[PDB]
Amino acid sequence: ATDKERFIASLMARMSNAEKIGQLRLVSVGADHPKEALMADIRAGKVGAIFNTVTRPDIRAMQDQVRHSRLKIPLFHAYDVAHGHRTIFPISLGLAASWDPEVVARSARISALEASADGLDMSFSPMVDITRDARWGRVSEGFGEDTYLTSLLSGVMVRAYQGSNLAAPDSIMAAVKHFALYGAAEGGRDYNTVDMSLPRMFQDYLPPYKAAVDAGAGAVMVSLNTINGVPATANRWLLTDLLRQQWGFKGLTISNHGAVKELIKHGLAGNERDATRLAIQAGVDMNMNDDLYSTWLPKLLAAGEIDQADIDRACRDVLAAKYDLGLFADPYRRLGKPDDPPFDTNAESRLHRQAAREVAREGLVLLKNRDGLLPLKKQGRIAVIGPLAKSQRDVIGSWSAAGVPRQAVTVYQGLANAVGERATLLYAKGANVSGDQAILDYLNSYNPEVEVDPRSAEAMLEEALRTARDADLVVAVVGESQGMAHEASSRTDLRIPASQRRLLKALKATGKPLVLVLMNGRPLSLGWEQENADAILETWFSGTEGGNAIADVLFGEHNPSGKLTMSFPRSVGQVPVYYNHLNTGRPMDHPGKYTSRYFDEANGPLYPFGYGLSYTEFSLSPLRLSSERLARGATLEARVTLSNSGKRAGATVVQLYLQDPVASLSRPVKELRGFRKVMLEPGESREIVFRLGEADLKFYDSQLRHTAEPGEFKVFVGLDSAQTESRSFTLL
Amino acid sequence: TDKERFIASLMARMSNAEKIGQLRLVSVGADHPKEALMADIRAGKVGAIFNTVTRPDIRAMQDQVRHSRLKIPLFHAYDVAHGHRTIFPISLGLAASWDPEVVARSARISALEASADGLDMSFSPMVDITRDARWGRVSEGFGEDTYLTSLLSGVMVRAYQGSNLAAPDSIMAAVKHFALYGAAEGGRDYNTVDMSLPRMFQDYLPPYKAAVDAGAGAVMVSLNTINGVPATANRWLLTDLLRQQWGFKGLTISNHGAVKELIKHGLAGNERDATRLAIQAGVDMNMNDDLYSTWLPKLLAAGEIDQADIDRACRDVLAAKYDLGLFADPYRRLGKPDDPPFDTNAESRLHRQAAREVAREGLVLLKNRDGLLPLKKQGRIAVIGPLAKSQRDVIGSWSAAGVPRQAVTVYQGLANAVGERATLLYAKGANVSGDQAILDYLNSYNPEVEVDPRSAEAMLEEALRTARDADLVVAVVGESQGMAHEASSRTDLRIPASQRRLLKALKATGKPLVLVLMNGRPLSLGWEQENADAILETWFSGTEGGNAIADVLFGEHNPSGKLTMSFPRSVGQVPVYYNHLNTGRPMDHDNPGKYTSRYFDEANGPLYPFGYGLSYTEFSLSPLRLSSERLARGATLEARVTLSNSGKRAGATVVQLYLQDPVASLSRPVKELRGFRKVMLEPGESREIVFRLGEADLKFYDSQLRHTAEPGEFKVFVGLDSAQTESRSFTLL
Ligand SMILES: OC[C@H]1O[C@@H](O[C@H]2[C@H](O)[C@@H](O)[C@H](O)O[C@@H]2CO)[C@H](O)[C@@H](O)[C@@H]1O
Ligand SMILES: OC[C@H]1O[C@@H](O[C@H]2[C@H](O)[C@@H](O)[C@H](O)O[C@@H]2CO)[C@H](O)[C@@H](O)[C@@H]1O
Numbered sequence A: 001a002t003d004k005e006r007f008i009a010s011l012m013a014r015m016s017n018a019e020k021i022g023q024l025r026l027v028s029v030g031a032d033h034p035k036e037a038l039m040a041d042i043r044a045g046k047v048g049a050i051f052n053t054v055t056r057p058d059i060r061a062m063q064d065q066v067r068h069s070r071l072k073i074p075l076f077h078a079y080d081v082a083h084g085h086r087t088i089f090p091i092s093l094g095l096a097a098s099w100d101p102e103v104v105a106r107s108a109r110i111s112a113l114e115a116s117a118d119g120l121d122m123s124f125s126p127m128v129d130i131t132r133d134a135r136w137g138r139v140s141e142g143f144g145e146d147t148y149l150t151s152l153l154s155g156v157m158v159r160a161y162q163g164s165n166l167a168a169p170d171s172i173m174a175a176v177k178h179f180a181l182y183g184a185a186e187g188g189r190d191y192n193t194v195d196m197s198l199p200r201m202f203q204d205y206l207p208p209y210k211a212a213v214d215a216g217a218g219a220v221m222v223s224l225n226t227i228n229g230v231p232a233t234a235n236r237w238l239l240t241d242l243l244r245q246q247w248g249f250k251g252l253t254i255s256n257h258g259a260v261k262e263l264i265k266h267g268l269a270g271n272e273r274d275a276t277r278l279a280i281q282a283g284v285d286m287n288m289n290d291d292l293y294s295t296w297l298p299k300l301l302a303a304g305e306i307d308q309a310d311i312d313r314a315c316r317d318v319l320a321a322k323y324d325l326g327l328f329a330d331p332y333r334r335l336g337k338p339d340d341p342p343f344d345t346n347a348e349s350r351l352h353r354q355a356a357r358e359v360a361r362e363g364l365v366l367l368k369n370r371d372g373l374l375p376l377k378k379q380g381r382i383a384v385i386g387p388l389a390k391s392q393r394d395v396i397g398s399w400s401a402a403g404v405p406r407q408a409v410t411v412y413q414g415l416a417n418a419v420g421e422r423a424t425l426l427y428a429k430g431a432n433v434s435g436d437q438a439i440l441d442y443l444n445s446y447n448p449e450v451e452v453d454p455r456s457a458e459a460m461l462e463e464a465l466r467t468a469r470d471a472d473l474v475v476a477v478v479g480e481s482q483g484m485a486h487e488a489s490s491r492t493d494l495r496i497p498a499s500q501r502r503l504l505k506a507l508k509a510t511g512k513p514l515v516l517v518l519m520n521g522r523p524l525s526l527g528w529e530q531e532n533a534d535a536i537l538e539t540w541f542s543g544t545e546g547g548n549a550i551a552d553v554l555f556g557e558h559n560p561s562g563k564l565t566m567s568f569p570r571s572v573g574q575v576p577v578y579y580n581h582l583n584t585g586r587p588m589d590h591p592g593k594y595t596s597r598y599f600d601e602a603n604g605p606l607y608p609f610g611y612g613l614s615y616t617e618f619s620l621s622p623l624r625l626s627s628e629r630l631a632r633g634a635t636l637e638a639r640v641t642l643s644n645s646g647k648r649a650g651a652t653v654v655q656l657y658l659q660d661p662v663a664s665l666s667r668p669v670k671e672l673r674g675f676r677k678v679m680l681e682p683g684e685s686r687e688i689v690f691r692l693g694e695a696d697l698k699f700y701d702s703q704l705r706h707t708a709e710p711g712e713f714k715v716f717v718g719l720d721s722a723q724t725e726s727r728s729f730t731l732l
Numbered sequence B: 001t002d003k004e005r006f007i008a009s010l011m012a013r014m015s016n017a018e019k020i021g022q023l024r025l026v027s028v029g030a031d032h033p034k035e036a037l038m039a040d041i042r043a044g045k046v047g048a049i050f051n052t053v054t055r056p057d058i059r060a061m062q063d064q065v066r067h068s069r070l071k072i073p074l075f076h077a078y079d080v081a082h083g084h085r086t087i088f089p090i091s092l093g094l095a096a097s098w099d100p101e102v103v104a105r106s107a108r109i110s111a112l113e114a115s116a117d118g119l120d121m122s123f124s125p126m127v128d129i130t131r132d133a134r135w136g137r138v139s140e141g142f143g144e145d146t147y148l149t150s151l152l153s154g155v156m157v158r159a160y161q162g163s164n165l166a167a168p169d170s171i172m173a174a175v176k177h178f179a180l181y182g183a184a185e186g187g188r189d190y191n192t193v194d195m196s197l198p199r200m201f202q203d204y205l206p207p208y209k210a211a212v213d214a215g216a217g218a219v220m221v222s223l224n225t226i227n228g229v230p231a232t233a234n235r236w237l238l239t240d241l242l243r244q245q246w247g248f249k250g251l252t253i254s255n256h257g258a259v260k261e262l263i264k265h266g267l268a269g270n271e272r273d274a275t276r277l278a279i280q281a282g283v284d285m286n287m288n289d290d291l292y293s294t295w296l297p298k299l300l301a302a303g304e305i306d307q308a309d310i311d312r313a314c315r316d317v318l319a320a321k322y323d324l325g326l327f328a329d330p331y332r333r334l335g336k337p338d339d340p341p342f343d344t345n346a347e348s349r350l351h352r353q354a355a356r357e358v359a360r361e362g363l364v365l366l367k368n369r370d371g372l373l374p375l376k377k378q379g380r381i382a383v384i385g386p387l388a389k390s391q392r393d394v395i396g397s398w399s400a401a402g403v404p405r406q407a408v409t410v411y412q413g414l415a416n417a418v419g420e421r422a423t424l425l426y427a428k429g430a431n432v433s434g435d436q437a438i439l440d441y442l443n444s445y446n447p448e449v450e451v452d453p454r455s456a457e458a459m460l461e462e463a464l465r466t467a468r469d470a471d472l473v474v475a476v477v478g479e480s481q482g483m484a485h486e487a488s489s490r491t492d493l494r495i496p497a498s499q500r501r502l503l504k505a506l507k508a509t510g511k512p513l514v515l516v517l518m519n520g521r522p523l524s525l526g527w528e529q530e531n532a533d534a535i536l537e538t539w540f541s542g543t544e545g546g547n548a549i550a551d552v553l554f555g556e557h558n559p560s561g562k563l564t565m566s567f568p569r570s571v572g573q574v575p576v577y578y579n580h581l582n583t584g585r586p587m588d589h590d591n592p593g594k595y596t597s598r599y600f601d602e603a604n605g606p607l608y609p610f611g612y613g614l615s616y617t618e619f620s621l622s623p624l625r626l627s628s629e630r631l632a633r634g635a636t637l638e639a640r641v642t643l644s645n646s647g648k649r650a651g652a653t654v655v656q657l658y659l660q661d662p663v664a665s666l667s668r669p670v671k672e673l674r675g676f677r678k679v680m681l682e683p684g685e686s687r688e689i690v691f692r693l694g695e696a697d698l699k700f701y702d703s704q705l706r707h708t709a710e711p712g713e714f715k716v717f718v719g720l721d722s723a724q725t726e727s728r729s730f731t732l733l
């Protein structure tokens, strides 16, 4: 037995059931748990962990209370450090668009450095749910629609948070979320029903969670949705059979917020006692906020409705997490010394602006650039118009953790910084983020999140048209506010808000060159924009340095290299659209009536998976395979030469897709199986070599057999999912 | 069994070429020119025909059989979906009757007319559950509810097949599309279907089982994948489930070109392997692509299939023909060789009274401000819109042998009703679409949409002049039938933009505005519900549609139709359906917070819920009473309520019973329909309604597909729609 198992067995042999049950309780200071009452419960050994306490003096005060409990078992402290702690990086969907594991790893490592510097031990991150439904407000928190890329980045984020040793003072534990399938909510409505086949679940939706487990994630946060009728919180197949027995996870499972009590609303339980029994016997170790475990576990055990082994499993997992975090060696390892001077948590000197700026550059996606309008010269008169141009609150995104809006660089400020006095900027708000007062009241319902200009729409439009007439070109900064792409904010319309589209149509009618800088947390419907704007830059929500990174691209300090990781539908009525779909019996070419299509809109996404432009031109040589036949246990090489055939240095992403065109299940028309992000000076050439073996060729059949079948495979290489060249080989 | 001995004696005579010929189902067309097809019938190489539909044409094919060695008769099939020559409303409108006897009458008359023309079989009923309004084939089903669709599935089969499948006024039902076709992802026709086995078993499979249990002679296999496996190659679906579990003894028929489509699905790399997959999965009869005739001999000689695969398939064809009476008399539906010739389309061979009476029952009153409807037969009525004079649209999609020139338009029904007592003024107003690419689609293959060559603005000014000269406006608007048909999936559920511009302009005249909606799917009607004075959903109401619509508008019939599919506020809410799960964070009138399962940019819930529809009278329900608070296994419970007509006009409504199982081993729906009663009442009349419930109503498939009723609370809800109910509880012991 390891030091950890010996230590835990010796501690648990000493504990009462009250102490073991106390370890399972995860709470936050708030209405339900006032601070002084919570401190008294920590002193009594009734608390296992805290979330949403995020400064060193507040965390140290809580850890000080444990010295009063009989066994002095330390707390751990968690937070939602999703894409940054104090220095906010782009939202995950924009990080994914970097196609660069090292950039994504740097965002996670800095997030862990900052969170651990504030005394935190754990982040409820990474979010690795696959998203094919643009309506869902939580698409901003994932890495897009692709199983290969999301799985790769899931393991990258875990390793970057946890480091070489979970006891390092600058490591935090990753609690991968949301296990499982949360992003397949029916209708894109948050928390809604998820219903899907086991082959789809295993092939497409579960691999990112398994990648996090295999990267050593210490914790798993359980989702709020049903899976095929069974809430994840009560799902013994998911949490025990799959996560523990099949995948071998040895860490901690954490319920979502009030999730145990929500089993009553889901109709699995008629009271809190039965909800508690279902959750702990399914495999939920730690109970977030609703305190059902502390209220009901003793009565359940005395009635023989649960086993002692249910409590022991759950407690062992909490203690094992604390052991790996170093907290039994030193409960203050992330909290410095008792004789440390006080400091300003929010000091500018504790931020990481260089890293945020460098990361944010990599995720920006050039969607359109007519006749080389971009990059802009630093000269002339530039009108900067729209409700997002001066928005600090929106550039940091949803789930901005301890980010301070006043510390963020707006798009306006970024342009001002870039041009100094070489160009003149003219500002007009142009429109409110929405013209619908019910939507503004929603967005401002808890906090003041959206500045509502008191002027009429007409007055703002006249001011913006005067500003555009006084300029050489217009940079319109438009899209969503961050509260439009957040938990529970599902959208029925994927367009830019109507108030802003009215502004864009008015700006277009001036005849001035029109550059759109889009801020948004989900794919948008951009048909009018693709037809009418001169250039389009997707910037997602780019974080604390967003405005500087966006100016870096617009003025060509950085040659855009971002590529989409989620298909952009032409309208909400096409949902879902995603690149790794099945052919059907009647596929549409581009073209007949009797094919799988809509009749009232053009078909396919407006922008496909892997799409994104450059200020330079790239060429690919013909694809070459090392052989036409592949033996089992051997490796196939796919080679292409990439050249920079243009006039500016830049990067692109060479993507490899596979198709299995004859199989015992209908397989996708293509599936991403590799990529290379390659930065080239003008006239440079690189031989790209992909390696494929049997593991790349397997799939789950109807009975969940996971093998590769002999026969043809098609290999596609290109700079997006739509513009590829292909060669075939045969697996023997 | 005389039948199994007759069939075994015949099959003992047949070569494999003869047995394989029985499996071939073809139509006259480019791929099968008439003279080549006739030569193949004489050679024993054809088992059945589809799309040949008149007595002289069918007799001519059956006459060719006399030249083959064994003289095995053909059967003849057609798509008699909602009528043969007399067209009833589309199925989604028949469902809105909530009256199994109305649905049975439409099917009986369809079978009478089709068998009168020599047909033996219809590819009907379509019983696919539909929760996605974008799909163009929702017009062909009975809406979103498993209980109602399952009930109507069995009614349709019994009505087609009668007491005896050999009767000359019977046809065989080929229930379709097995299975799950209406769950196409994105609402895109033919697209991927992916769902859990508990959802499949509880909600989507029961209508097909109801058809099998009602004695359907045939099952038509679907075009989609189910969890990755095309239905056409799905041995689990076609053999394990349909034959071994459900005990189906009849004929399986591939869809059109479906065996060859296994190559596009990526299950086969060539036609030989596609053929092997389909016959071994359990597809008996091969529609149109001739892969069975081309490849089965080679497959069998290579040992890639078994003789038993050919024998199973041939036996099922011969057994269908036996049941249809065709071995006793191949001409039993074709009269005598010297019957005089007749006009297939004669007016005396129609059933207009039945079509008019059935079409009245499906019409749904959605809005009626301050008693505008019913109208008086007087004054000046402007009849405006591209569907007002459309014969082609009123008969719907899948209109079989219906003749548009025999149909009654909405304009003609109003003209019939008012005679000389009122003045009608007509203006087209708008084309069905202002988008030339959409008109190009709707006129592709066949010119089905009349395009007025004037500008949109000229058509609008003419309609405004007409409206200004009238006392009120009847706007006849919505979809053309080609917008809600196979492959016509929509991304927008609104009335078309050209017509919404027309409605906004008409509203601005101040004239009372009555909307008569034609459509084959739920529509997004938020502006209409706010601005029209009255709204009548007429679906596509068939050959007598215009007369049934006038009957309602002038109050000869009190509208009694109720929705069987939820109407979303917009396409971005799809899917919306009444029997959804609660979730952990429900949004409803009792749960109105930010952190719930909702959209933020639109009102939540459907605009019109399942079971919604208004009347020209008012109804009252007494309090719901249960016969006991406890139910023992093996016993039945009664739920009683009294329905009263508390208004001034006779009319019907539909009392609906829903069940909830609020604590279960799976999350169960907030409500599930478990009974209904359509009741016609005079003013001041009352009817005591007694619903019976037992354990069978309470069971569900759990995660292991155990069919279980668990002890505990059940809530019983009664009301006149799914949103306006009250509940009482009982406990199952
Ligand atoms: O709902 C707002 C509320 O959510 C709380 O739970 C979060 C949980 O912390 C997070 O990791 C997960 O991704 O989402 C759930 C909500 O679905 C959160 O702790 C609160 O701070 C927040 O106010
Ligand atoms: O695609 C139009 C074409 O469909 C043919 O097959 C029909 C089949 O007859 C019907 O029962 C089923 O519901 O739909 C398939 C098409 O999906 C039909 O036989 C042809 O008449 C028709 O032109």
Ligand SMILES: [Mg+2]
Residues within 6 Å of the ligand: A660, A661, A662, A663, A709, A710, A711, A712
């Ligand atoms: Mg293969």
Ligand SMILES: [Mg+2]
Residues within 6 Å of the ligand: B661, B662, B663, B664, B710, B711, B712, B713
């Ligand atoms: Mg129950």
